[PDB]
Design a protein around this ligand. Structure first.
Ligand SMILES: Cc1ncc(COP(=O)(O)O)c(/C=N/[C@@H](COP(=O)(O)O)C(=O)O)c1O
Length: 430
């Protein structure tokens, strides 16, 4: 840890501005009735990037961390040559989160959710005796499983049975990581609901999803990487969204950077995207509603089965909560896009051909939205554009590797019995 001290911060309730000390894992302001995110106010007002040996923690001034964990990697930002020329753009930057050693990208789990894992796990008390509970569509689960296994952190994952192929590892994991799943046909929110049932057990505590400032501020290191590389704040931020937490985080990073002052005073326009036919946040945004629209549960689950990008389908995202995605899009003058599977597949091929690495379908959704925005005349050719490639390099990383898969200890019906779930998860760690 050489010259490290725990990051100093307080919390602010976004709805009221009330400022208070984090007593430990606060996910909300107990004094605020309306649903609201809380947001860190960092005492280190101006960011000082630490040396490369800090890995992901080089951004620790604006991460709510009490220690550093070994073996982390930061996002990498570089100026595009091939893709930029294809799109006619003069100032296209790619922030790459995954495995691409030729550019210095060494996130071995192959997605930006590694930033969440290293941030959240370093916020946790090392003497913590409760089991951390995380729900995920796959990539967050893989990152947390690896970090928690390596660090002997007790972790209960809830992942849809249909998504467990995402839970691959180079070597067997420590038994301190256990998995439960909702049955086949269930979607990400079904796994979230299952995790809420498990959390009724004493001895378990919620990671909290978008409510966890460590998750948001970890993802925001993509923007911190881009701004400190470029030397100014981009005009546009492109990211594919399921919950929207990474776009909320990008906005929050932008606000902190403006307060720092050294990088300019402009606000990046958020350009977010979903994969048709699972586009409920797009639909709510285009309607002008801060509330998610009616969406029959069975139709939503079927739509989640159709999309290529299985991580972009949350029926109950942080859209309307104060500080959530509606507020972020309003504050940034943002826009919402849809990509079909066909567009995402074209984008994956385009990125591999012109930039030299494979990317996930979710990242292809983001790139497809950039292709479409450029074709629509929305992006001036000199604009500074940040394309957040949220996952990639899995094909290269897996080559000539024998993988081990984390499989569920229990699979539960979509509406499970509470006493059954609680007894079973208690026995997993007893
Ligand atoms: C490669 C990739 N790109 C984009 C996203 C969307 O992230 P968001 O900003 O939080 O919606 C994801 C989200 N993955 C999540 C779905 O998580 P989420 O709770 O929506 O943040 C998962 O792995 O559990 C992703 O894996």
């Amino acid at each position: 840890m050489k010259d490290f001290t725990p990051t100093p911060y307080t919390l602010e309730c976004v709805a009221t501005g009330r400022e208070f000390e984090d007593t430990g894992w606060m996910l909300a302001d107990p004094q605020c009735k309306t649903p609201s995110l809380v947001r860190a106010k960092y005492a280190r007002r101006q960011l000082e990037v630490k040396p490369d040996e800090y890995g992901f923690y080089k951004f620790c001034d604006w991460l709510p961390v009490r220690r550093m964990l070994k073996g982390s990697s930061a996002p990498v930002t570089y100026k595009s040559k091939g893709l930029a020329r294809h799109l006619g753009l003069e100032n296209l930057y790619i922030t790459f989160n995954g495995y691409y050693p030729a550019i210095g990208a060494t996130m071995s789990t192959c997605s930006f959710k590694e930033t969440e894992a290293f941030s959240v796990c370093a916020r946790a008390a090392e003497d913590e005796e409760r089991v951390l509970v995380v729900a995920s569509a796959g990539n967050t689960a893989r990152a947390f499983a690896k970090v928690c296994s390596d660090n002997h952190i007790k972790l209960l994952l809830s992942v849809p049975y249909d998504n467990i192929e995402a839970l691959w590892f180079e070597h067997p994991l420590n038994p301190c990581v256990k998995l439960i799943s909702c049955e086949k046909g269930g979607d990400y929110f079904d796994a979230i609901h299952l995790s809420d049932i498990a959390l009724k057990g004493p001895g378990f505590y919620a990671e909290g999803g978008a409510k966890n400032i460590a998750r948001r501020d970890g993802m925001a290191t993509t923007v911190l990487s881009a701004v400190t590389t470029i030397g100014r704040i981009p005009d546009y931020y492109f990211q594919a969204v399921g919950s929207g937490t990474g776009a909320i985080a990008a906005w929050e990073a932008n606000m902190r950077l403006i307060e720092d002052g050294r990088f300019g005073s402009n606000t990046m326009k958020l350009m977010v995207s979903q994969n048709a036919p699972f586009v409920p946040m797009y639909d709510a945004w285009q309607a002008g509603s801060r509330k998610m629209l009616a969406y029959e549960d069975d139709k939503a689950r079927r739509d989640a089965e159709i999309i290529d990008a299985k991580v972009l389908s949350n029926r109950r995202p942080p859209y309307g909560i104060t500080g959530g995605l509606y507020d972020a899009l309003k504050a940034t003058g943002g826009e919402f896009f849809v990509a079909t599977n066909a567009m995402a597949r074209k984008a994956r091929k385009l990125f591999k051909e012109l930039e030299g690495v494979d990317i996930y379908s979710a990242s292809g959704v983001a790139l497809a939205s950039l292709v479409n925005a450029v074709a629509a005349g929305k992006i001036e050719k000199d604009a500074v554009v940040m394309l957040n490639i949220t996952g990639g390099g899995e094909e290269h990383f897996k080559e000539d590797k024998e993988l081990w898969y984390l499989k569920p200890s229990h699979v539960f019906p979509l509406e499970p019995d509470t006493d059954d779930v609680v007894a079973k998860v208690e026995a997993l760690f007893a």
